[PDB]
């Protein structure tokens, strides 16, 4: 790295003024300050900082690659702490440990082999949404042989990892779960806490399951803590997320959250009429953000006595996208809000009601790990409101005009507020946009400016590669829906006749340049450039939706759509029925008539529809 006129950081190559001490032709004692000082001295990985390489242009480690027994976990953790998306990082590391990990079976036939090298390494890799086939097989196999042996605590963590592995089959994973439940049913019924309870349900959410009986029990205990006023805001929001995947349509629970928002808005407004204005949640969250940056700067200066750092908080360990930071919340609830609504029920009490109609058994104890009282933030934040609201929409709660009305109004008030769309994780930004589009005819004032600001930040996050394909697919699919009005224009032949049509609102803030900003490219071309550069990372269901949306903003670029013709032909068999309908619309709208691809797609669609019988004026009669 000869160029050093733009990155004045510590450790230029390896040593401040040396390169491996000019060793001849062992390499641990004189270089242990490489990883140690690289933990808080390098900006996050992105496109503008290509000089940031894990291997440092093939200089470290590698010329056989050895001597990695010590710095095995440290190295791994580093990668995961900054969201690296470079291919020549993982392949090299894995290979290096080939002789070091396979040789650890001495005592099996000094740390511990599974939970201290395989389980820890897998976790790190998973966070990065990386492909690791070797790790899947080895971990899966081990679980299948010593399942019973493992204790409850170990089982819980083990299962979590597996569940978080899309590579793994869905049939196999499910089976194993049954054993765990059956073995551990009574033990885990009263001696549980919200912190650990959520972990269990996550397994069942990301993977298909039929353990309805078991799920109900867990939820019962959780609601107990809610009535007692012990669940933290972090936990409250977390519970809602999982519910969406499980399609748990709970009335008494959702209603509580609905009313909680109402009181938050009301109380604030009341105090504004007298003179005393309590700080908002939005500002509190951002207030501590500056402190974390202040301490980081002083630490570097003290350690070295002699922009790029934009998204440095979301990549920190322990931060959960869509909720916030774990150690940024305090317990609150019935002690500070409504005390009436959710119906508490305990193990003891449940028994009584079981019979006729007309403390020693159950004991709830939240504080076990650490004291939850940092005098930080209270109540829900601006961004926390959006995430919770999305769940309701999915379930179909907005239909019922009982509670969603007032709730929706509250959000819109704060949404259009000045300086309110710049402090929130990108995960939350996707949910907020859905709320506006889901109810277009039930809003007080058209938030045209809100969409413009939100869209600007969404392109910025996608360019840095800090968003998963699934999270980036909702914003775009839902944007077209918002900018669309159904009308009944007169027919071509008979003017009295009517036919329903679609009209799309024009956009005048997506095609123009941005000379003021560093990125002179527009918001539309930037999305396309990144999509084609990383087409392989996107799945088939995640590719047709993004392409279908680009053509809806009048993108007359036949060359852009001509790159995917070779990619789709070689992967036609892996295409679902929904994928066919989401790809033809795009080419036709842009006036791109392709006969070599459309002829082949006709056969695939008909073959899938070979097992559905539909008759006239009756519908589908026999299916499969």
């Amino acid at each position: 790295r000869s160029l050093r006129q733009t990155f004045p950081y510590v450790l230029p190559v390896i040593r401040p003024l040396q390169a491996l001490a000019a060793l001849p032709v062992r390499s641990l004692e004189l270089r242990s300050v490489s990883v140690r000082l690289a933990h808080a001295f390098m900006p996050p990985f992105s496109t503008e900082t290509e000089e940031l390489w894990c291997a440092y242009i093939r200089r470290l480690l590698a010329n056989p690659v050895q001597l990695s027994v010590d710095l095995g976990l440290q190295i791994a953790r580093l990668f995961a702490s900054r969201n690296v998306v470079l291919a020549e990082a993982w392949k090299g590391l894995f290979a290096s440990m080939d002789p070091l990990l396979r040789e650890l079976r001495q005592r099996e036939e000094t740390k511990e082999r599974f939970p201290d090298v395989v389980l820890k390494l897998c976790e790190a890799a998973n966070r990065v949404r990386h492909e690791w086939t070797w790790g899947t097989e080895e971990l899966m196999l081990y679980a299948r042989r010593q399942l019973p042996a493992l204790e409850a605590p170990e089982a819980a963590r083990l299962l979590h990892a597996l569940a978080s592995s899309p590579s793994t089959s869905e049939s196999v994973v499910a089976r194993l779960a049954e054993a765990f439940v059956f073995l551990w049913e009574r033990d885990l019924s009263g001696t549980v806490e919200p912190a650990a309870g959520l972990q269990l349900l996550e397994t069942l959410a990301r993977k298909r399951a039929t353990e309805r009986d078991f799920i109900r029990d867990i939820s019962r205990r959780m609601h107990c803590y809610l009535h007692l006023g012990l669940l933290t805001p972090f936990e409250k929001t977390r519970l809602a997320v999982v519910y969406r995947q499980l399609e748990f349509r709970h009335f008494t629970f959702f209603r509580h959250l609905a009313e909680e928002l109402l009181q938050q808005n009301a109380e604030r407004q009341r105090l504004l009429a007298l003179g005393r204005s309590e700080p908002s949640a939005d500002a509190l969250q951002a207030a501590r953000q500056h402190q974390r940056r202040q301490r980081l700067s002083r630490l570097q200066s003290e350690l070295n006595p002699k922009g790029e750092w934009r998204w440095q908080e979301y990549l920190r360990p322990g931060y959960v996208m869509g909720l916030g930071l774990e150690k940024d919340f305090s317990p609150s609830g019935v002690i500070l809000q409504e005390e009436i609504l959710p119906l508490v029920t305990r193990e003891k009490v449940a028994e009584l009601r079981r019979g006729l109609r007309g403390s020693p058994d159950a004991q709830e104890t939240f504080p076990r790990s650490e004291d939850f009282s940092p005098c930080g933030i209270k109540a829900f934040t601006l961004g926390q409101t959006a995430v919770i609201l999305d769940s309701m929409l999915f379930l179909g709660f907005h239909h019922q005009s009982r509670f969603f009305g007032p709730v929706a109004d509250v959000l819109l008030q704060r949404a259009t507020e000045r300086g309110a769309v710049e402090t929130l994780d990108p995960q939350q930004c996707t949910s907020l946009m859905v709320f506006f589009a889901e109810t277009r005819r039930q809003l007080s004032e058209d938030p045209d400016d809100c969409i413009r600001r939100l869209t600007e930040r969404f392109v910025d996050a996608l360019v840095c590669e800090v968003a998963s394909p699934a999270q980036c697919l909702l914003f775009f699919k839902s944007l077209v829906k918002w900018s669309a009005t159904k009308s009944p224009q007169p027919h071509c032949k008979r003017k009295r006749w009517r036919e329903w049509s679609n009209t799309y609102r024009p956009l005048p803030w997506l095609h123009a340049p941005r000379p003021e900003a560093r990125d002179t490219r527009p918001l539309l071309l930037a999305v396309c450039k990144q999509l084609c550069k990383r087409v392989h990372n996107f799945s088939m269901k995640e590719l047709t939706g993004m392409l279908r949306a680009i053509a809806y903003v009048d993108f007359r670029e036949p060359a852009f759509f001509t790159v995917f013709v070779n990619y789709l032909k070689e992967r036609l068999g892996e295409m679902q029925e929904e994928d066919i309908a989401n790809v033809t619309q795009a080419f036709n709208k842009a006036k791109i008539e392709e006969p070599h691809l459309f002829s082949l797609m006709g056969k695939r669609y008909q073959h899938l529809q070979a097992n559905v019988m539909a008759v006239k004026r009756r519908g589908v009669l026999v299916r499969r």
């Binding site: 006709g602 008909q606 008759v615």
Partner: protein
């Protein structure tokens, strides 16, 4: 002499145009889309037999058809079993040209419905479902 398996009347009007030229298209200009459903309606009789293709994705719009006179069979030769078999082959062969794989089969009678079904399976035109809706009188 100089026999041809087609329609002499239409052959005289030939002017070098490609196939499927007079057939109407859609707004997008595509003759056929990948997402579509077809249901051939076959009607039998004593001498001749007709079988037209109906597209269920275009409000039951006909695309093309064939008859005993479109294969070079005339006079009493139509009554023979070969007349039905030849007609089926033309439909199956022409189906591959358009780009259709699965086509349903519908008929009212069961007299001359054996030669057509056998010919479809000998080229690639499969059968997904069989429909029979005999309109029997409900009064004397």
């Amino acid at each position: 002499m100089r026999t041809l398996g087609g329609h002499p009347r239409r052959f005289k009007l030939m002017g070098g145009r490609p196939e499927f030229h007079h057939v109407d298209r859609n707004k997008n200009g595509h003759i056929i889309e990948p997402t579509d459903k077809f249901q051939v309606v076959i009607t039998t009789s004593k001498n001749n037999v007709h079988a037209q293709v109906v597209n269920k994705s275009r409000a039951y719009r006909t695309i093309f058809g064939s008859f005993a006179g479109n294969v070079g069979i005339r006079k009493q030769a139509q009554q023979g079993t070969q007349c039905a078999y030849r007609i089926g082959q033309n439909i199956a062969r022409k189906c591959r040209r358009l780009g259709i794989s699965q086509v349903e089969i519908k008929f009212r009678r069961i007299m001359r419905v054996n030669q057509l079904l056998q010919a479809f399976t000998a080229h690639g035109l499969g059968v997904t479902a069989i429909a029979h809706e005999p309109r029997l009188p409900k009064c004397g």
